[PDB]
Design a protein around this ligand. Sequence first.
Ligand SMILES: Cc1cc2nc3c(=O)[nH]c(=O)nc-3n(C[C@H](O)[C@H](O)[C@H](O)COP(=O)(O)O)c2cc1C
Ligand SMILES: O=[N+]([O-])c1cc([N+](=O)[O-])c(O)c([N+](=O)[O-])c1
Ligand SMILES: O=[N+]([O-])c1cc([N+](=O)[O-])c(O)c([N+](=O)[O-])c1
Length: 348
Amino acid sequence: NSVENLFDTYKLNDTITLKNRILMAPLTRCMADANLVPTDDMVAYYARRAEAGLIISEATIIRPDAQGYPNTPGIFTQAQIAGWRKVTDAVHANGGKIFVQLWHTGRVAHPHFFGGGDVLAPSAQKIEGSVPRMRELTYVTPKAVTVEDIQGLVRDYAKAAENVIEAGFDGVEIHGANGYLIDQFLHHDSNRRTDEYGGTPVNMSRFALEVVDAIIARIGHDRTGLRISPGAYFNMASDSRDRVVFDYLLPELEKRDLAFVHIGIFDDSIEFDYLGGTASSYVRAHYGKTLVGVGSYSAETASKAIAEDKFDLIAIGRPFIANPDYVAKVRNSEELVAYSDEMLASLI
Ligand SMILES: Cc1cc2nc3c(=O)[nH]c(=O)nc-3n(C[C@H](O)[C@H](O)[C@H](O)COP(=O)(O)O)c2cc1C
Ligand SMILES: O=[N+]([O-])c1cc([N+](=O)[O-])c(O)c([N+](=O)[O-])c1
Ligand SMILES: O=[N+]([O-])c1cc([N+](=O)[O-])c(O)c([N+](=O)[O-])c1
């Protein structure tokens, strides 16, 4: 089956044209240094994947209380900016483009990482268990943020975006997906607020739009994308009312003319009854601009989906871990190395 359309050039907007439709999905590797600064190993890892139309970086924290896993990079200190500059220079020298994925974990943060402070979330809705590979770090009940806390978070997302431009990135993907802070406001399970950030679709969408709008004001809409998870699957329980939240959010997002919206899902064959089907097909039916699909696609099934007008670009995750030369191999009809979790131990 054909993969020809994956090698079409794709104009995102006047600012950015991608050399092909293949994106490297954001992939947390937990290999930044103790100061959360990218390393030379990380520089080389991203550089060798610059055949992608666009790389989305691993989730990168906007400030200290965003941290929930060990050694995830940040971009709030000057040293972190300098480390990322090495990454972006290498990607560009290798002919690529790269966006940072800006991250706050919300209720999934853990105070071990930031000196014992409050975990912040829309509501005091604790998650169960402990940080992966650190069982001693039991999750805690979040403090429900105040409006002033929210404005501080919005400011820090925007400042992080400014830092991203300083570090030489082509843009930002806002992590509004997969159960983390922005997604926590967008679902009823996690957002039990009764103020202007809870209840109705406009209120539950407010935080996401404030973050989007604050970042656009600093770096521009052409360099701003957003990942979303209308279908709850990762650290999030669904609620049928979540449907009307996203029915409102999507047309509002379209007004901002973002570089792209990106689905957050792992296996996109999964359907959500309240969305009337798959996460990607729900978004496609209710959003009319560039859409990045993802989640257990091969080059072949992604190409078919794009030919079927299901989405516009394909993000590839696990196969990009196993194949730095994913794009070259797909282009030249070469067979791919199978992904295995054991490969997570090395940054190649
Ligand atoms: C090891 C690993 C790390 C991931 N880290 C992130 C991340 O930092 N940010 C994010 O939005 N998704 C992350 N994901 C989800 C991927 O971006 C992607 O949606 C998922 O792997 C499904 O795509 P695939 O079938 O091509 O692997 C991660 C997935 C894996 C397997
Ligand atoms: O496995 N992971 O390390 C991982 C990490 C993130 N993240 O933003 O830090 C995700 O969004 C996802 N995810 O939802 O697939 C997975
Ligand atoms: O995307 N992901 O990185 C991811 C990772 C895990 N995991 O093993 O921790 C999952 O269970 C899922 N999941 O089930 O959706 C997704």
